[PDB]
Structure formats: C-alpha cells, structure tokens
C-alpha cells in the first residue's frame with residue numbers, strides 16, 4: 187500500500203526490537219536498494235544491527 | 236565487476252552450500268529486486284533457502 191503513492195521515503199519510529207524486525211522484513215521483500223531513504227528515529231542509532 | 240557490462244542474468248552453478256552463501260551476499264548487497272534473473276543450476280532446487 188505504500189507503493190500506491192510510490193513512497194520513496196519512510197521515517198521509522200519504533201523501539202529497539204521493532205526496528206530490527208521491520209528492517210529484516212524490508213530486506214526480505216527487498217526495499218533497501220539505492221532509491222529509497224530511511225531515518226531511524228531513536229537515540230540508539232548504533233544499537234540496532 | 237559484474238556491473239561493468241550491466242549483467243542482468245546470472246546462472247549459479249554451485250553446490251548446496253555455496254548457493255546459500257551467494258544468495259545471502261546478493262541479499263546483503265541488494266541485487267534481488269525485479270529486473271534481475273537467476274538460475275539455480277542444480278537438481279535440488281527446493282533444497283536451498
């Protein structure tokens with residue numbers, strides 16, 4: 187449904203466990219190539235993988 | 236080096252241990268979006284992940 191508006195840009199605001207799950211599902215569906223953008227809205231940006 | 240001639244279609248002739256490593260590295264570098272074609276050149280096609 188995010189591809190309906192052709193969203194090239196998503197800001198993620200989740201906890202230290204949900205960020206890893208969303209990034210793993212994005213990697214599974216393949217939406218991390220050059221052409222998109224992401225912002226991990228937390229203080230521990232290096233805490234995730 | 237495979238992006239020099241803009242190679243789109245790659246045949247993987249590897250055993251059941253190296254195919255999973257090549258697929259994991261493709262997913263890590265992000266080259267499994269729509270536009271590329273791959274052939275798992277073996278007999279146990281459903282053996283890999």
Ligand SMILES: *[C@@H]1O[C@H](CO)[C@@H](O[C@@H]2O[C@H](CO)[C@@H](O)[C@H](O)[C@H]2NC(C)=O)[C@H](O)[C@H]1NC(C)=O
Nearest residue numbers: 193194195196217218219220221222223224225
């Ligand atoms: C990566 O971040 C930049 C912002 O620093 C995004 O915008 C680019 O900004 C540079 C300026 O340093 C321009 O020269 C580029 O033309 C801009 N990109 C575009 C597409 O216009 C850039 O979009 C980001 N990358 C992605 C894939 O979103």
